[PDB]
Amino acid sequence: EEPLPVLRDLPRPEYGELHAPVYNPAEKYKEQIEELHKFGRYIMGCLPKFVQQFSVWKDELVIYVAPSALTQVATFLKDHTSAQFKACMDVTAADYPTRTNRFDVVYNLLSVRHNSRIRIKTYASEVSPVPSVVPLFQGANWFERETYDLFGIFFEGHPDLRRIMTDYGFQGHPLRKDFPTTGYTEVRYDAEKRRVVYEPLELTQAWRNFTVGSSVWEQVGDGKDFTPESFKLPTPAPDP
Amino acid sequence: TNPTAFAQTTRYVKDSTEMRTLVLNLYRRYLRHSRGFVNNYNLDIPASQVRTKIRQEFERQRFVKDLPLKNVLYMKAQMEFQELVNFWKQQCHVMQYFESIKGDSFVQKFLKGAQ
Amino acid sequence: STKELTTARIKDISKPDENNLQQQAPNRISPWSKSQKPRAEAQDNVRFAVKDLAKQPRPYAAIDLIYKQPIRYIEHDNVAVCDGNGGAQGHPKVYINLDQNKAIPCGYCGLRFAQAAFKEDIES
Amino acid sequence: VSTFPLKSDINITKSGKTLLSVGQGGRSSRTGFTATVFGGTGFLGRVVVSKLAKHGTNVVVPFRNDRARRQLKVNGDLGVVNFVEFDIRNLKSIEDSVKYSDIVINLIGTEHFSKNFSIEDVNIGAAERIAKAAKEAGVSRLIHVSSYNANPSSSSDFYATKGIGEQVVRDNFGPDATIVRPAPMYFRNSPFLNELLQIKALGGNVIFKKEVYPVHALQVGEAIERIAFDDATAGQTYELFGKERYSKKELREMIKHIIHIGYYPYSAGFYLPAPEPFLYAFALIRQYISSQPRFNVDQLKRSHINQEIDQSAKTFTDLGMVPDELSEYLYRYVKPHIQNRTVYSKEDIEKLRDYVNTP
Amino acid sequence: SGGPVPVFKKYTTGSKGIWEKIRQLLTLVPNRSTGNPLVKNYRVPPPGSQTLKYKDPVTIPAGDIVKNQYYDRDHRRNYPRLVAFDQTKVSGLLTLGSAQNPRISVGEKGQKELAVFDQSVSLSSTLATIDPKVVKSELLAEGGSPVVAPSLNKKMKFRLTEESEHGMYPEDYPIRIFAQN
Amino acid sequence: TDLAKELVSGAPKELITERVARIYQEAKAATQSGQHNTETWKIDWDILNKGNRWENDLMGYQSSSDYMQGTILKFDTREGAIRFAKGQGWDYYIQEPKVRRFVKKDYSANFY
Ligand SMILES: NC(=O)C1=CN([C@@H]2O[C@H](COP(=O)(O)OP(=O)(O)OC[C@H]3O[C@@H](n4cnc5c(N)ncnc54)[C@H](OP(=O)(O)O)[C@@H]3O)[C@@H](O)[C@H]2O)C=CC1
Ligand SMILES: [Zn+2]
Secondary structure, X not given: OOOOOOOOOOOOOOOOOOOOXXXXXXXXXXXXXXXHHHHHHHHHXXXXXXXXXXXXXXXXXXXXXXXXXXXXHHHHHHHOOOOOOOEEXXXXXXXXXXXXXXEEEEEEEEEOOOOEEEXXXXXXXXOOOEEXXXXXXXXXXXXXXXXXXXXXXXXXXXXXXXXXXXXXXXXXXXXXXXXXXXXXXXXXXEOOOOEEEEEEOOEOOOOOOHHHOOOOOOOOOOOEOOOOOOOOOOOOOOOO | OOOOOOOOOOOOOOOHHHXXXXXXXXXXXXXXXXXXXXXXXXXXXXXXXXXXXXXXXXXXXXXXXXXXXXXXHHHHHHHHHHHHHOOOXXXXXXXXXXXOXXXXXXXXXXXXXXX | OOOOOOOOOOOOOOOOOOOOOOOOEOOEOOOOOOOOOOHHHHHOOHHHOOOOHHHOOOOOOHHHHHXXXXXXXXXXXXXXXXXXXXXXXXXXXXXXXXXXXXXXXXOOOOOEEEEOOOHHHHOO | OOOOOOXXXXXXXXXXXXXXXXXXXXXXXXXXXXXXXXXXXXXXXXXXXXHHHHOOOEEEEXXXXXXXXXXXXXXXXXXXXXXXXOOOOOHHHHHHHOOOOOEXXXXXXXXXXXXXXXXXXXXXXXXXXXXXXXXXXXXXXEEEEOOOOOOOOOOOHHHHHHHHHHHHHHOOOOOOOEEEEEOOEXXXXXXXXXXXXXXXXEOHHHHOOOEEOOEEHHHHHHHHHHHXXXXXXXXXXXXXXXXXXXXXXXXXXXXXXXXXXXXXXXXXXXXXXXXXXXXXXXXXXXXXXXXXXXXXXHHHHHOOXXXXXXXXXXXXXXXXXXXXXXXXXXXXXXXXXXXXXXXXXXXXXXXXXXXXXXX | OOOOOOHHHOOEOOOOOHXXXXXXXXXXXXXXXXXXXXXXXXXXXXXXXXXXXXXXXXXHHHHOOOOOOHHHOOHHHOOEOOOEEEHHHHHHHHHHEOOOOEOOOOHHHHHHHHHHOOOOOOHHHHXXXXXXXXXXXXXOEOOOEOOOOOOOXXXXXXXXXXXXXXXXXXXXXXXXXXXXX | OOOOOHHHHOOOOHHHHOOOEEEEXXXXXXXXXXXXXXXXXXXXXXXXXXXXXXXXOOOOOXXXXXXXXXXXXXXXXXXXXXXXXHHHOOOEEEEOOOOOOOOOOOHHHHOO
């Protein structure tokens, strides 16, 4: 039944000068880089008709396929035992207006089987449809519904495609780069009509674009080479 | 999982003629529900004008030539119908849709700041 | 009047009064910036029609206060070091050169430093 | 409404004030003016305040009912609609309601009298004191509102004080004071369309024989906008009314079918005919028993007077606005009191007029 | 372990004297704390009235005045470059081997071969025409075995515990607690 | 590309009829000697002849009714900008960047 200690007063460790090793954080992914490279090539060899190219970054493997190669590669990665990606976590997009097909549709698959994640990238334009993966993954029903709402991508084969985020009868797809961040209209309560009405946008304080004062010097270099020494073409050695 | 009421599958049509049959079919579906649109949305105008303004918006796109433009304008064509039937829009939105409204002389625009 | 109340001056002309609500600040009559809106014009507005101007915020003008400080005088050195008299709770440390025969104010604090040998001319 | 309430962005007043507008006319825009709507918490004030504040015109709203003014602020942006507590038995408050203004509007008026104010003190005393103070406060334009039969010779007290009220304004403010004489204004929650919809209307036959001309409350609100923003309307008198002639007895019955209300209308008390000497007596008693404004004696005399049009005054064609007929607007203002919903267009309403008068 | 702890060993207010004996006689579990913190212990020197003079911590290699060149520890600019392997480079690696396991001739004869895969080479053709041992050695693994998806955590394993060890719900409740192993 | 893609973007009609966009490459700033902000092509919209900026009466803000005032697009090839402008049916005009003329600079030139 001893009285409780006063934890404020108990002695604390004494340290002199602290030492912590400095080493490149990208080194600890070295083993993961080779194994994704091998398994990335394996998918390409199995399906040369579809896999345009594959890429590895640290611990993330990406497979680049055409829109017409989507259902095939998705099915292969779902059913093949060596790569059982039953769970699709994310369906999204990104806008790069400089490219001919601006939208870049990206899928993230999870394999609870082997504890792995794979990424599928497939492009799309404003008018060209993309196959819907809803027949394979039911979890993409709303992720495709969201991508259309914010990017206007036509998804072929979706059972019920409609707005999910923006208001009903909202004009324009917000995440397209050409859509201004403040939109086009705004609402207020009109006394005469006894109802909330839309009016064209008019900001009391116009948005200030401080992004113009960005860096005029390039800030990060060319990077470093971390490709496994088993995935570089050998240099033909000079002759005697 | 099952789709909601008045839903349709999203298929990219590849024939021009096939689309017009869908386009013409959809037009009566708008026309058929016009009285219910007034009743459900408590519109202050008779259903005749509701049928009147539906037709105009179809013609606005009549002269598109390229096919990929035709589908997307049809894909979004169905979506606006589906929301209207299921009472998803509020009364404020529908009123303002049909409550919408000659340009001033050069002096008049100049006098008031123009654009 | 409205002549001093609407134009900025380095120093005022008449003695400021704390009760006069038309002054720019309770301890200064005229504004201290060329683009500062006079307080007389600011309160001549519809939104002040039924207000109590004595209870609106009237902080003491900082220009008049800072010139009430004495000039620091440095002995046998032409460079003064100022840090806001708080170290880690002041401004960054800035070194002031006192070769010219005048009092050079600090960039942040506004304290004026000079040389002791120059005090007699400065105090004229 | 539209997109810009002005015809020009620079507007010089009678007093040498140069008002420069900024913006496109939306919420964040301004017009440079500063009005003062008296009785903005009244029926007509709410529409008038809303239109002015909708386009960035600062509006000072003197009020006495603290809660009734709260909903006025939604119409204007930050700092636009300002509130000044006042009482017409207080002069200092009125001299602050008009201190910074460039337009003064006077919607204060009554057809009933109270234990603290009579009709003489309100329709005549208040308007006079406003114009006297608005003149000494250097206001360029004053707009006044009176009844539709302003006639200082009328035996009715309402048109006796409303008619004299016109004079004492121009005799106080001067020969620049505009005057507006709207017809019975119909709108949502309007005093006119109310008693037509009220079920237990005691003395219906006595009250509803009076004939008037319907007029849109919004058009009256929009008309007042055109008057304030135009300097060519100074000293002019406006008689605002509609074209088609309607009688309350016609309306009280045309309304009856839209409401869809056999034995019931007689049993429910919809028809409550009354000998006139009783009505003069019961309305006499409620002046000092009821704590609320009831249908009083003076209002009874008005039921004996049809609307008169003073043809020497102006109309909506002077403002380039087409008056709106009650045919197209009666239905949307009875939907609150109202298978398939039965919708009446202009043709449906006019045909319904035929049925009422057909025996 | 997380075994039950006597009430007087927890920093909450507890009764004393006759009421302690009443509290133990009537409560279901006598070692349950009221939850009201000890006034004399909890936050007693407030955060604004402490005694510790804080000093900025600095590990030596990255905070030193010496042997502390920034380019040694400038990891943000040593990021891994983005390399995409198209079908052509896979074919070149497949046919010619890798940099570690060369299968290319030397000198100008080799420079002839590398230039072959410097332009488009579809991988469908490459697998059709190459030694079957190459696939079993380069593309596939362990003598023709497939390539299983790599694991993000080679140390992710689980094992079944029991209530005498995990302390949670007994065997009857419909959940099982998994350890690391 | 050739399609009238603007009919699916839901953008207001005024960007086609009433506004003018500009395709330009940002110029080098005189103050600084860096040459990196001048390597990507950008699209910006012209300001409005009235209602671009006006002073808020109450707090002195900068009110605006231009919903494209803070919209700048980025590209990496000139053609992609022109193609994208063509796709949306924008009434653009291209601003060709100036090219600095090469002049060799020698240390010895100060005396020769
Ligand atoms: N259909 C109609 O409404 C018609 C009305 N008119 C006249 O238009 C004028 C405006 O009335 P309207 O808006 O339509 O409806 P109201 O009768 O409700 O408006 C009366 C206004 O005057 C104010 N008022 C009355 N007495 C006082 C007082 N002692 N002190 C301060 N304010 C007072 C009221 O303030 P508060 O609200 O706080 O009580 C109210 O704002 C009236 O004179 C009316 O006779 C003429 C033709 C048609
Ligand atoms: Zn300093």
